Design an enzyme around this catalytic site. Structure first.
Site, mmCIF file in Angstrom:
data_model
loop_
_atom_site.group_PDB
_atom_site.id
_atom_site.type_symbol
_atom_site.label_atom_id
_atom_site.label_comp_id
_atom_site.label_asym_id
_atom_site.label_seq_id
_atom_site.Cartn_x
_atom_site.Cartn_y
_atom_site.Cartn_z
ATOM 1 N N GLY A 45 -1.714 -7.210 -9.297
ATOM 2 C CA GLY A 45 -0.771 -8.316 -9.286
ATOM 3 C C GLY A 45 0.335 -8.171 -8.254
ATOM 4 O O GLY A 45 0.124 -7.633 -7.179
ATOM 5 N N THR B 221 3.491 -6.959 -3.296
ATOM 6 C CA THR B 221 2.148 -7.283 -3.713
ATOM 7 C C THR B 221 1.342 -6.007 -3.881
ATOM 8 O O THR B 221 1.453 -5.068 -3.085
ATOM 9 C CB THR B 221 1.509 -8.231 -2.679
ATOM 10 O OG1 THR B 221 1.673 -7.676 -1.365
ATOM 11 C CG2 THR B 221 2.272 -9.523 -2.602
ATOM 12 N N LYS B 222 0.548 -5.982 -4.947
ATOM 13 C CA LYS B 222 -0.238 -4.823 -5.343
ATOM 14 C C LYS B 222 -1.719 -5.199 -5.519
ATOM 15 O O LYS B 222 -2.455 -4.514 -6.208
ATOM 16 C CB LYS B 222 0.326 -4.237 -6.643
ATOM 17 C CG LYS B 222 1.843 -4.079 -6.672
ATOM 18 C CD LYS B 222 2.332 -3.642 -8.044
ATOM 19 C CE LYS B 222 3.845 -3.491 -8.077
ATOM 20 N NZ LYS B 222 4.362 -3.387 -9.469
ATOM 21 N N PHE C 297 -7.937 -4.047 17.435
ATOM 22 C CA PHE C 297 -7.270 -5.320 17.724
ATOM 23 C C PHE C 297 -6.982 -5.482 19.219
ATOM 24 O O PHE C 297 -6.170 -4.753 19.787
ATOM 25 C CB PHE C 297 -5.974 -5.454 16.930
ATOM 26 C CG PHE C 297 -5.314 -6.793 17.084
ATOM 27 C CD1 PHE C 297 -5.890 -7.929 16.529
ATOM 28 C CD2 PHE C 297 -4.123 -6.924 17.796
ATOM 29 C CE1 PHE C 297 -5.285 -9.172 16.669
ATOM 30 C CE2 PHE C 297 -3.521 -8.159 17.938
ATOM 31 C CZ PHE C 297 -4.097 -9.286 17.376
ATOM 32 N N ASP D 143 -2.618 -12.908 3.204
ATOM 33 C CA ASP D 143 -2.068 -14.076 3.897
ATOM 34 C C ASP D 143 -2.115 -15.291 2.989
ATOM 35 O O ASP D 143 -1.192 -16.120 3.001
ATOM 36 C CB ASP D 143 -2.814 -14.364 5.197
ATOM 37 C CG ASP D 143 -2.677 -13.246 6.213
ATOM 38 O OD1 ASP D 143 -1.593 -12.631 6.292
ATOM 39 O OD2 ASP D 143 -3.604 -12.921 6.978
ATOM 40 N N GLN E 38 -14.618 0.499 6.551
ATOM 41 C CA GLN E 38 -14.328 -0.310 7.734
ATOM 42 C C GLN E 38 -13.459 0.420 8.761
ATOM 43 O O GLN E 38 -12.399 0.948 8.427
ATOM 44 C CB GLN E 38 -13.649 -1.626 7.319
ATOM 45 C CG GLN E 38 -14.555 -2.854 7.395
ATOM 46 C CD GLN E 38 -13.924 -4.097 6.780
ATOM 47 O OE1 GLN E 38 -12.711 -4.154 6.579
ATOM 48 N NE2 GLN E 38 -14.748 -5.097 6.484
#
Ligand SMILES: [Mg+2]
Ligand SMILES: [Mg+2]
Lengths: 299, 299
Positions: free
Chosen positions: A218, A213-214, A112, A246, A108
C-alpha cells in the site's frame, strides 16, 4: 496568482523496449532475442497519459528527438488530446529510450539512452498556468528550475524517483522546500531521510503532503494533521509492475484536481495502479475514472 | 560447372549500436548512456563490403527489415556497388541489430535482435554463379542448405563463428563435409575438435584448407600438403577489435579470387585486419587493395 483545471507533467517522454533473452552473455559470446516490442513510456508521459485517461486535462513538457516527429508516439498523444505544445523537438538527437534486457527467471537489467534530454540544460521553464506542475524524472537542474518557478503559483508535485542519487543533500533540500506533494517509494524515502537527517516531521515543515508508496503493502500519506494508511488494491493478475508508480501518481493528482480529500486521492491512486500492472507497457491498461471508482467499490 | 569472378556472402546484415555506460545496473536501478552511434555491421555484410573495398565484386544474401528500405544502410551498399539483388526485405520484422553495452574498464556485454532473420526458415537458397560462396553467421539450417547446394559448383567458405554452439556433432560434420575453406578462431576450433573428436588431419579429409585465426598471435593455414604460419601484422593503434575477423576473411577470399597462393591469401587477410581494428565499426576503416599491399611491404 493560482491557475487552471489541468496538470503539467515535466520530465521524460521515452520509448521502452523489452528484450526477452535466455541468459546474459559471458565475455566473447552471442546470445539472442527474438523480437522487441516498443511501448510508449517515460515517467512524465506515463503520468500525463494516465491523468488524461482519468478525465483531467494534462500537458507535457519533455525533450523529444528527430524520430518523435510524425512517429507513433506523437500521433498517439495528439489523438488522446494531450497538450504537447511545450515539447522541445531536437534536430540532432533521438528520443530518450530504455533498453531492458530480461531473463528466464525474470531478472531485469536496464539501460537509459539520454539522447534529446541533453537539451534541458539549454532551456528554461515557461510560466505554467496549471493547478499542478508534476515533476518526474528528467534533468534535475531543469526540474529544480521548474519547482522554483512554479512554487507559490502552481502546486508542485515531485518524485525524485531513480534520479534520487543525483541530488546532493543541498539540492534535495532545495527542491523539497519548493514542493507541495512529495512522492517517494519506501527505499528512496529511507535513502533521502538518511541523507537529509530528516524524520517525517522535518519533511512536513517543508511540504504539504508526503506520500510514501510501498507497492504491494500500500501507501501512506503524511500531513501535519494526519497519517493516512492506504491499502493496496488487488489486481487481477500482475503482468508488468513497471507502470504502477506513475499510475498511482496520475490517479492521486487527478483525484486532487477533481476536488477529493487526500485519503480518497490515495485510494484512487491505489486503484489506478491496480489496472496498469495487468498488462505490459506503462500506458497500455490505463483505466478511465468510472472504471477506477468501480474497482474501489469492490475493494 | 564452376562460376564467375565474384564472391557471394550469406548471412547477417545488421546495425550495431555501442552504448557507453558507467556501470551495469543492480536490481531496481537506472544508470544511463549519453548517446549511441549506429555502425553498419553483420558478419556477411562486413565481409562483402571488405571484399568490394579490395576490388572484388561481391553480392550479399541476407534477410533485412522494413527499416532497411531507403535507409542509411541500403543507399550505402548501393553506393559501394555491392549487388544486393538477393536481399529478402521483410514487411513485418525490423533489420537484425546488436545492442552492445560496454563499461568503464572496457568489458562488453552484448545482445542480438534476431528480427528479420526469422525469415531464413521460410526461404531456400538460389543457384549461385560466383567463384566463392562465403557462409557467415546467420541461420544454421539455411546456411547448411547453401553449403549443400553450392558445394561441387562454387567454392564454399564457412566459419561457424558465434553460431558454433547451435551445431550438433552431426550437423557440424555435414556442413564441414560441404566446405572448401573452413575458418575458425582458436577457441571455436578447440570446441569443434572436441565435439567432432577431430584432429587436423580429420578436417583435411573433408576440406581443402583449414584456417585457424589467433588474432594478435597471427593465424595458421593447414592443407593436406602444408602448414603455413601467418604472422599478425602490426596496426597503428587498436580502437575496436570487432571487425577484425570478418576483415581477415574478406582479405583472404579476395586474394584467393585474385589468384594468389594460400600463404599470400593469409598475409593479405592479416594486413586487412590490421586496418579495420584502427577505428570503431566493422566497416569504417576497410582498406583498399593497394593500401593493404603497401602495409605488407613494410611488415
Ligand atoms: Mg516552506
Ligand atoms: Mg569430401
Amino acid at each position: 496568482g493560482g491557475k487552471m483545471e489541468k496538470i503539467t507533467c515535466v520530465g521524460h517522454t521515452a520509448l521502452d523496449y523489452i528484450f526477452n533473452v535466455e541468459k546474459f552473455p559471458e565475455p566473447n559470446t552471442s546470445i539472442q532475442i527474438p523480437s522487441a516490442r516498443k511501448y510508449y513510456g517515460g515517467a512524465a508521459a506515463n503520468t500525463a497519459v494516465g491523468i488524461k485517461k482519468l478525465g483531467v486535462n494534462s500537458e507535457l513538457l519533455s525533450c523529444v528527438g528527430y524520430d518523435f516527429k510524425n512517429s507513433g508516439y506523437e500521433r498517439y498523444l495528439k489523438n488522446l488530446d494531450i497538450n504537447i505544445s511545450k515539447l522541445y523537438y531536437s534536430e540532432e538527437e533521438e528520443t530518450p529510450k530504455a533498453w531492458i534486457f530480461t531473463d528466464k527467471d525474470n531478472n531485469q537489467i536496464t539501460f537509459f539512452l539520454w539522447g534529446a534530454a541533453k537539451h534541458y540544460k539549454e532551456l528554461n521553464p515557461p510560466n505554467f498556468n496549471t493547478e499542478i506542475v508534476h515533476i518526474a524524472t528528467g534533468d534535475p537542474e531543469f526540474n529544480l528550475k521548474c519547482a522554483k518557478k512554479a512554487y507559490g503559483n502552481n502546486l508542485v508535485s515531485f518524485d525524485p524517483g531513480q534520479d534520487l542519487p543525483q541530488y546532493s543533500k543541498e539540492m534535495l533540500l532545495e527542491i523539497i522546500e519548493h514542493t507541495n506533494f512529495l512522492f517517494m517509494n519506501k527505499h528512496e524515502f529511507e535513502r533521502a531521510s538518511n541523507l537529509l537527517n530528516f524524520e517525517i516531521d522535518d519533511y512536513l515543515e517543508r511540504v504539504d503532503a508526503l506520500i510514501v508508496t510501498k507497492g504491494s503493502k500500500g501507501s501512506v500519506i503524511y500531513t501535519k494533521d494526519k497519517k493516512i494508511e492506504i491499502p493496496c488494491i488487488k489486481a487481477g493478475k500482475v503482468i508488468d509492475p513497471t507502470g504502477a508508480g506513475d499510475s498511482y501518481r496520475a490517479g492521486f493528482l487527478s483525484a486532487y484536481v477533481k476536488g477529493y480529500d487526500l485519503e480518497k486521492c490515495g485510494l484512487i491512486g491505489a486503484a489506478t495502479a491496480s489496472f496498469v500492472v495487468e498488462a505490459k507497457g506503462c500506458q497500455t491498461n490505463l483505466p478511465t475514472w468510472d472504471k477506477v471508482v468501480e474497482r474501489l467499490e469492490k475493494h
